[PDB]
Design a protein around this ligand. Structure first.
Ligand SMILES: CCOC(=O)[C@H](C)NC(=O)[C@H](CC(C)C)NC(=O)[C@@H](CC(=O)NO)CC(C)C
Ligand SMILES: [Ca+2]
Ligand SMILES: [Ca+2]
Ligand SMILES: [Sm+3]
Ligand SMILES: [Zn+2]
Ligand SMILES: [Zn+2]
Length: 163
């Protein structure tokens, strides 16, 4: 028990995509989520393994409206997605608003870009004030999805560096 955010004490985590969005072909959803994990994996000693059945540290799903938690979704626009901080059960899980039009290109809203942000929460990060950072509280799409120095510093402060 220390201060700051809750973190995972395990370094090898598993994730599972519970349901898929009909907005994109299955392969593009898998790619977007795998690439998002890779970003954070590149700068820390964390590893992620995808499971098809059973429980996993990070469960991912596409839902709309009221979905059994205290923050029901709001239809197109507004809130795009949310995630829980590390911990048992629902901890680390990420929920994406299905009422949004998810994309695999530059048009709103790029799944990969939003997933990268949500997984940061799943790993224990809070928001950044840097408008160039992935953890910024609002959606921005620059044309590429990469960690800003602010994102790299924040995740390394918790789990350390890689190599
Ligand atoms: C430019 C502003 O409006 C927009 O472009 C779109 C419509 N909405 C948003 O960007 C809203 C903004 C809030 C002010 C409602 N933010 C989010 O949905 C965050 C929620 C979060 O923190 N999840 O972890 C998710 C990430 C994609 C940043
Ligand atoms: Ca969990
Ligand atoms: Ca919404
Ligand atoms: Sm949709
Ligand atoms: Zn939710
Ligand atoms: Zn956020």
């Amino acid at each position: 028990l220390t201060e700051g955010n809750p973190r995972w004490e395990q370094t090898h985590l598993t994730y599972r995509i519970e349901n898929y969005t009909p907005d994109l072909p299955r392969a593009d959803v898998d790619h977007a989520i795998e690439k998002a994990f890779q970003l954070w994996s590149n700068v820390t000693p964390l590893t992620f393994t995808k499971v098809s059945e059973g429980q996993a540290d990070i469960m991912i799903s596409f839902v709309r409206g009221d979905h059994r938690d205290n923050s029901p979704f709001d239809g197109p626009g507004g809130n795009l997605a949310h995630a829980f901080q590390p911990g048992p059960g629902i901890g680390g899980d990420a929920h994406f608003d299905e009422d949004e039009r998810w994309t695999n290109n530059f048009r709103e809203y790029n799944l990969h870009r939003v997933a990268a942000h949500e997984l940061g929460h799943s790993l224990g990060l809070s928001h950044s004030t840097d408008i160039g950072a992935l953890m910024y509280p609002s959606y921005t799409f620059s044309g590429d999805v990469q960690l800003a120095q602010d994102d790299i510093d924040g995740i390394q402060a918790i789990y350390g560096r890689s190599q």
